[PDB]
Amino acid sequence: AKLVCYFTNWAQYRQGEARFLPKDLDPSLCTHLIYAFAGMTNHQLSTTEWNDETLYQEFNGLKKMNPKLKTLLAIGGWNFGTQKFTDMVATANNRQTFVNSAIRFLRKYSFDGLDLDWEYPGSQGSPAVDKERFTTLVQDLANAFQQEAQTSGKERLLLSAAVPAGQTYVDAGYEVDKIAQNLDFVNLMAYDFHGSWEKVTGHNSPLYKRQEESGAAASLNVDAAVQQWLQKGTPASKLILGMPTYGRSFTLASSSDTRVGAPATGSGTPGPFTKEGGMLAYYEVCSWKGATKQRIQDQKVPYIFRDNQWVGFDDVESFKTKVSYLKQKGLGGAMVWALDLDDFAGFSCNQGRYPLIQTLRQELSLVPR
Ligand SMILES: CC(=O)N[C@@H]1[C@@H](O)[C@H](O[C@@H]2O[C@H](CO)[C@@H](O)[C@H](O)[C@H]2NC(C)=O)[C@@H](CO)O[C@H]1O
């Protein structure tokens, strides 16, 4: 089993106990640690924060403490957009520039692989031609990593990708059967199914549909997303089930209607540390005072409300349920977005350090013995 965990290079800017620093990294928590994010400059892999090189040293330095650990560098992410990917994959020349730069960069900074986080080929401004061009990029990288291993004698660089759960994005961008052959593993972003972009409450990451749902909505759940990727050709062993250590929040139209599917007027109030309306870290919801926690019976996940605020999130129990699910489906492991949104320092939830991610590790039978 794998436990793939994302580090984010902006968590260092949060205030107080929420500030995530190198000391908070645990070398034996996860099997694979992925650094979010690198960017691109003139079609070449590049850093995005002023101190990334310092953090790379710390991050990859964890392997001294745990030599089994593998690290990857993720390129892209939501905020990065699509244009630079589009321009880079447009020509064989630009792809070659990128691929060669990636190999040199990963070797220079001691990463074990690259995680592709283009959000997304064929959508968010990216043209339809990018679906096949993404397939080619994945192939170019896989083949070049294979060649570098042969020439250098070093262990081959890993290639993974973070991929969307919704059919609209999947079909616009991803030749699933083709790319799955060339990726070492596939990080399924089984979250952000619902959020304050909608005008009714819905859960960030429900396991199953609700009985009331129909149409496309009935596929906006973890089980449907997993089945989608499997049926379209991803080997179960390569599919890694993403898990969110955050929730998505709403302002309710009325404090008297707190159901799933109740009218909402917009994003929930920003959290005191994360300061982003519409999301909350686990450590910002786990210890809500004077609130009412509820479970969505069909969907196997909790929500919580207080006055006109409503949040769908994941807890220890829902993580257990989801690991039982992934094991039943024979998947390759779990992925987590993100280290810094769990109660990494044990300051809030009275559950010790990393209560959610330690649950994944335990349920996957990955505890260091
Ligand atoms: C691997 C992965 O899930 N990548 C995406 C993430 O970028 C995204 O997290 C969001 O990243 C933005 C930067 O690109 C941040 O500004 C933003 O705050 C952050 N949002 C959260 C909840 O962490 C995650 C999560 O939505 O999913 C992908 O879209």
- Token pair recorded at residue 355: 């209560």
- Cα–Cα nearest to 282, from 204, 364, 219, 197: 204
- Cα–Cα nearest to 55, from 9, 116, 107: 9
Report the distance separating Cα 289 and Cα 8, nearest Å.
28
Please give the method by which this entry was determined: X-ray
User: Do the Cβ atoms of 341 and 283 come closer than 8 Å?
Assistant: yes
User: Which pairing describes strands 185-189 and 44-46: parallel, antiparallel, or unpaired?
Assistant: unpaired
Which residue is closest in CA terms to ligand 1's atom 11?
78
For residue 347, CA distances in Å to 11, 216, 248, 279, 289 come to 16, 40, 21, 19, 15
Q: Is 43 left (phi over 0), alpha (psi -120 to 50) or beta?
A: left
User: Do the Cβ atoms of 330 and 324 come closer than 8 Å?
Assistant: no
Judge if 1-244+314-369 and 245-313 fold alike in CATH terms: no
For residue 229, CA distances in Å to 129, 209, 302, 303, 359 come to 21, 17, 25, 27, 25
Gap from CA of 274 to ligand 1 centroid (Å): 12
For residue 344, CA distances in Å to 27, 49, 340 come to 13, 22, 6
Catalytic option among 17, 53, 58, 119 = 119
Gap from CA of 337 to ligand 1 centroid (Å): 8
Q: What count of other Cβ atoms lies within 10 Å of the Cβ of residue 236?
A: 13
- Token pair recorded at residue 290: 């004077």
List residues near ligand 1 (CB under 6 A).
6, 77-79, 117, 119, 162, 189, 192, 246, 276, 279, 337-338
Atom of ligand 1 nearest to the CA of 338: 23
Phi and psi at 81, nearest 5°, equal 75, -165
Report the distance separating Cα 180 and Cα 256, nearest Å.
47
Report the distance separating Cα 242 and Cα 222, nearest Å.
9
Atom of ligand 1 nearest to the CA of 242: 3
Atom of ligand 1 nearest to the CA of 37: 14
> What are the sequence ranges of the domains in the chain?
1-244+314-369, 245-313
Gap from CA of 253 to ligand 1 centroid (Å): 27
User: Do the Cβ atoms of 183 and 238 come closer than 8 Å?
Assistant: yes
Distance of CA 154 to the CA centre of its chain: 28
SS3 283: helix
CATH for the 245-313 domain, from 3.10.50.10, 3.30.2350.10, 3.30.1330.60, 2.60.40.420: 3.10.50.10
Gap from CA of 9 to ligand 1 centroid (Å): 12
- Cα–Cα nearest to 203, from 221, 177, 187: 221
Report the distance separating Cα 303 and Cα 134, nearest Å.
37
Report the distance separating Cα 331 and Cα 2, nearest Å.
9
User: Do the Cβ atoms of 59 and 109 come closer than 8 Å?
Assistant: no
- Cα–Cα nearest to 165, from 239, 260, 80: 239
Number of H helices, E strands in the chain: 10, 15
CATH assignment, 1-244+314-369: 3.20.20.80
78 annotated as a binding-site residue: yes
Return the exposure string of 139-164: e unless at least 16 CB atoms fall within 10 Å of the residue's CB, then b: ebbbebbeebeeeeeeebbbbbbbbb
User: Do the Cβ atoms of 45 and 113 come closer than 8 Å?
Assistant: no
Whether residue 119 lies in the annotated active site: yes
What's this structure's resolution in Å?
1.1
- Say which residues have a Cβ less than 8 Å from residue 160's Cβ, sequence separation at least 6: 4, 34, 72, 113, 114, 115, 116, 183, 184, 185, 186, 187, 240
